């Protein structure tokens, strides 16, 4: 453990990735030029996990930016922190994926993949001790989805002993109108079940619902959704980038979170929920942070945790607070809600407290749950997939790329087995 290699694929992946880099640079005291201007040795202790130190006291993200479309790369370079990235790390095609998983995975993606692997190999071989990889992408499009999963498989081939981690954005008809999103997401989930060690399920259905219902934003934009994604990504990576005892690296996190290989889809939670530029009046208390953290309304995946059972939970508290109060509040939740935590995994809730709060807040809490309720996300995608597949809708766009109908049948079957497996552990008893 030390270095993490970050990969950003497609429009969503690059937008969410760029936001992650600007948020974490601010936390680590790094400005858009790569210079450290912070005021705390804690900010630099584990800087090497995400940044390479270049000549002249500059810090460079260990990030690879990928797209089959050039426009997104221009948007990244033009962004606030756009100048911090390594120019040789931008790997882009000229003809997009046209929101087609098959084009991203087999055709256009395959044509670009080796150029990407050459850049990831250069970053990986420069590592003193590589933890693994972190990929940001959507499952609904063509590049992030198809090419992103192709990259995962190609990387798994060359680095079989490293951890593969993803921030996978799940499609929703509430935010996108592309009819093929159920096909692209099911084909990707099939790949993720087999090839990743840990996946953060970032659901556009839940992000939209939070913005509309809680934040009272009549017309949520990707900027509003991405404000919730970046808060979450900062929270779930806190333990990796600051000194601490719990889930300090990708493997220790996986060992604590993943009891069965296929069951590696996490339901992230965050408190307090805020809107871009909302003037947050008074910091929350520890009982308020704990109550909200397990609340369905604070979940970044559109699943009710009360509809399932927690296999494992990681809770991260940020800011200056009593560790005694956190311990009491955390024990109270488990004792009161005993039935929503599997009895056959003792002490399955792990808590960490980081003194450094995120930007704009004095106190915050991040929840990472491995809940059997995530089956609701997969069932929603499966039902949308089946409605289309049963009518043989839009199939020619996929088969036209050389794919067979059987791949669709197989992907659907694998996702339904995953749902069945969650249900099996939901019903299992310590007997």
């Amino acid at each position: 453990m030390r270095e993490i290699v970050h990969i950003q694929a497609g429009q969503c992946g690059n937008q969410i990735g760029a936001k992650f880099w600007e948020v974490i640079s601010d936390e680590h005291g790094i400005d858009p030029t790569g210079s450290y201007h912070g005021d705390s040795d804690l900010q630099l202790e584990r800087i090497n996990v995400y940044y390479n130190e270049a000549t002249g006291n500059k810090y460079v993200p260990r990030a690879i930016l990928v797209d089959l479309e050039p426009g997104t790369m221009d948007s990244v370079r033009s962004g606030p922190f756009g100048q911090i990235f390594r120019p040789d790390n931008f790997v882009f095609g000229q003809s997009g994926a046209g929101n087609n998983w098959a084009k991203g995975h087999y055709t256009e993606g395959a044509e670009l993949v080796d150029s990407v692997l050459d850049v990831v190999r250069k970053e990986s071989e420069s590592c003193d001790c590589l933890q693994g990889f972190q990929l940001t992408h959507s499952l609904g499009g063509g590049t992030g989805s198809g090419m992103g999963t192709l990259l995962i498989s190609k990387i798994r081939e060359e680095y079989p002993d490293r951890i593969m981690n993803t921030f996978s954005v799940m499609p929703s008809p509430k935010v996108s109108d592309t009819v093929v999103e159920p096909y692209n997401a099911t084909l990707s989930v099939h790949q993720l079940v087999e090839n990743t060690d840990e996946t953060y399920s970032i659901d556009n259905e839940a992000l939209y619902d939070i913005c509309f219902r809680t934040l009272k934003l009549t017309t949520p934009t990707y900027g509003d959704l991405n404000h919730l994604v970046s808060a979450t990504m900062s929270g779930v990576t806190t333990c990796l980038r600051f000194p601490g005892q719990l889930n300090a690296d990708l493997r220790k996190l996986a060992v604590n979170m993943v009891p069965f290989p296929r069951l590696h889809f996490f339901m992230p939670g965050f408190a307090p929920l805020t809107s871009r530029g909302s003037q947050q009046y008074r910091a929350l208390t520890v009982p308020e942070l704990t109550q909200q953290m397990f609340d369905s309304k604070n979940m970044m995946a559109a699943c009710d945790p009360r509809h399932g059972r927690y296999l494992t939970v990681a809770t991260i508290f940020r800011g200056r607070m009593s560790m005694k109060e956190v311990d009491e509040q955390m024990l109270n939740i488990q004792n009161k809600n005993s039935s929503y935590f599997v009895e056959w995994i003792p002490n399955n809730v792990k808590t960490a407290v980081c003194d450094i709060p995120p930007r704009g807040l004095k106190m915050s809490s991040t929840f990472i749950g491995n809940s059997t309720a995530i089956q609701e996300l997969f069932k929603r995608i499966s039902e949308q997939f089946t409605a289309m597949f049963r009518r043989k809708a839009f199939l020619h766009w996929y088969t036209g790329e050389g794919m067979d109908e059987m791949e669709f049948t197989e992907a659907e079957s694998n996702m339904n087995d995953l749902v069945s497996e969650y249900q099996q552990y939901q019903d299992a008893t310590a007997d």
Partner: protein, 159 residues
């Protein structure tokens, strides 16, 4: 139509039936276009909001209004599988054979989506089965390439 135009589009996308009515009375423009050229009628047609479609039409909405991709509300309801909306637009003068920037007719889109009942209503209303999109595909070709046996039988009778 300023504040009212954006508010009317929001209410037709959300299916806020009573908020659409309140905005019409206040003078919101029925054909107020969005970023993509979509009128409140295209949004009601995508999302499946039958009553909104009917209130918009009674308040003189443009049934054949084309967005920036050249899709009318009939192309959208046909793609999204809203049979009852496809029947309402047709009865109110929707262009069965309207063509977008890609050469797609509503039949092209219903065949690709596999909407059997929509294809039947489109053919009943005079959809041309010999129309070719910019890919050189008829709706029969679309069903054969998709592997759709039931739909290719439904279209072969004319083609």
């Amino acid at each position: 139509g300023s504040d009212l135009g954006k508010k009317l589009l929001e209410a037709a996308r959300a299916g806020q039936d009573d908020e659409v009515r309140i905005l019409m009375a206040n003078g919101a423009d029925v054909n107020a276009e969005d970023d993509s050229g979509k009128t409140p009628l295209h949004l009601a047609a995508i999302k499946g909001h039958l009553e909104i479609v009917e209130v918009l039409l009674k308040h003189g909405a443009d049934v054949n209004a084309a967005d920036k991709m050249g899709d009318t509300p009939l192309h959208l309801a046909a793609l999204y599988g809203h049979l009852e909306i496809v029947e309402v637009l047709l009865k109110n003068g929707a262009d069965v054979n309207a063509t977008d920037t890609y050469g797609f007719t509503p039949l092209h889109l219903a065949a690709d989506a596999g909407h059997l009942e929509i294809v039947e209503v489109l053919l009943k209303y005079g959809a041309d089965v010999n129309a070719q999109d910019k890919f050189g595909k008829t709706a029969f070709d679309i069903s054969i390439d998709n592997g759709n046996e039931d739909l290719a039988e439904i279209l072969q009778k004319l083609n």
